[PDB]
Structures are given as C-alpha cells and as structure tokens.
Design a protein around this ligand. Structure first.
Ligand SMILES: [Ca+2]
Ligand SMILES: [Ca+2]
Ligand code: NA
Ligand code: NA
Lengths: 139, 139
C-alpha cells in the first residue's frame, strides 16, 4: 500500500492532507460518511498531516468499521437473483446490520425514514445505493 | 442565529449538511482545521444532518475551542504598532497559547518546525496568518 499512499501524497513530503486521505480511502473501497473519515483523520494526524504508518492503522480500522460496495452488492444480489431490482426492507436491515458496524438499529430506522422506506415494504436497490453514496458524501 | 442557519440550509429541511456546517461556522469567524469542524459534525448530527439546536450547542463549543481572526489580529497588532510586519516567535507562542485551546505546547513547536520558524527568532505576520489558514483548510 505504500506505493498508493505516496501516489496520493501530492506534494512528496510523506504526509497526506485530509482530502488526499479521504480520496485514497474511498479509492480503496471504504463506504462511509465523509465526516466519519475526517474525524479519523483529525484523531490520527500530526501537524504535518497523516504519515504512512498512521494511515495503515487508520485504514485497517476504517475497513472493519464499514463495508465496501462489492460486499453490499454481493449480499444484495443473493436476494435478487432474478434481477427484479427490489429487495425487502427488512432484508436490507439485516445486511446493513451484518456487513459494517457504523449503523445501530436506531440509525437504520432513521435512515429508512429519511429515504421513505417502510419496514414492511421493499426497497429499490439502484435508488438506495445511489442515495446512500450521495448521503455519505455530504455528511 | 436562526436566520443564518436557515439561510445556509440549502434544501429547506431544517438540517445542515457537513459542507453547510463548515461554511457557516467559518463565515461566523471560527478559525480551525477542517477535520476538527468535521469531527464535531460527525459527533453531533442525526442521520438527517445537523438541526438548529445541535448547531447552537456545537457552535458555542467551537467558539471556546478556537479563536477568530479579529482576536488573533488584535493580539498581534498590540506587539507590532509600528507595522514592521514581524513579531517574536515566542510572543506568537504566547498568543496562540492564550486565545484558543486547540494547540498544546508540543503542537505549537510542531507547527513552528513545519513552517520553519525558530523559537528564538521572528515571524513574518502576513505569511504566518496566510499559511495557517491554508493549513487549516487542508487538514
Ligand atoms: Ca503530502
Ligand atoms: Ca438541509
Ligand atoms: Na500502521
Ligand atoms: Na443548542
């Protein structure tokens, strides 16, 4: 990963800025709110920025605290093999409980309420993934 | 402050996004790292974003945890009334110790080392304020 770190270190000093950190972690597959990524940066950077070894520690921890888009998609596709485009909201709740731990049950309900998803109904998978990316980028 | 909050709430739902929060807090005079602002947002927002009452609590706390540019400038100008453009680095250290508490002594030293400022020397005030704004925006 050192090659990739240094690639994203735009000024060649061995430290990432906050935008370079966010951009690298997203490139590497992390799916989560910008402010949560920024918060990890704030707690694990020196004045100069984030060094390679703080980065690998943070990146390991981000990786546990979240999922990637391959992971969510595989789990969704398992329940829509016919490609109808929809899954049950409660099965989405299961998946999101299962694959990353940056949502508790109460945060899932608040997310479903925000998006207009009923607990006994279905969710349109493309719209959900798109809205959730968008949400994450702005929060 | 409610009028200003709702002004920066771009979609009229009563909640700020992370960029609207950062932009409003900066407009209101807060001087501090983006990732520290983002970290406060991450800890004090619901799924929908940041409500007016979470905002006024956060904003009060940001205000204590930092300074504004009027505050630093007044304190600098007190030591350069002749407008030479320079102050002693140790007097800058005093000021930064004094007027916001998001720097400890060790973070001041690391900042001075980063900018090439010697402890027994002087600091060029315009260059310092400019570099520090820049630093804060990218970290
Ligand atoms: Ca760098
Ligand atoms: Ca809003
Ligand atoms: Na490490
Ligand atoms: Na409040």
């Amino acid at each position: 990963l050192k090659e990739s770190f240094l690639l994203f270190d735009g000024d060649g000093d061995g430290y990432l800025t906050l935008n370079e950190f966010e951009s690298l972690v997203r490139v590497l597959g992390v799916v989560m709110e910008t402010s949560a990524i920024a918060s990890t940066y704030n707690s694990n950077s020196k004045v100069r920025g984030m060094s390679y070894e703080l980065f690998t520690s943070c990146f390991s921890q981000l990786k546990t605290k979240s999922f990637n888009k391959d992971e969510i998609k595989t789990a969704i596709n398992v329940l829509d093999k016919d490609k109808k485009g929809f899954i049950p909201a409660i099965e989405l709740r299961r998946i999101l409980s299962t694959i990353g731990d940056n949502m508790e049950q109460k945060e899932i309900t608040d997310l479903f309420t925000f998006m207009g998803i009923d607990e006994q109904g279905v969710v349109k998978v493309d719209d959900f993934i798109n809205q959730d990316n968008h949400h994450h980028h702005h929060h």
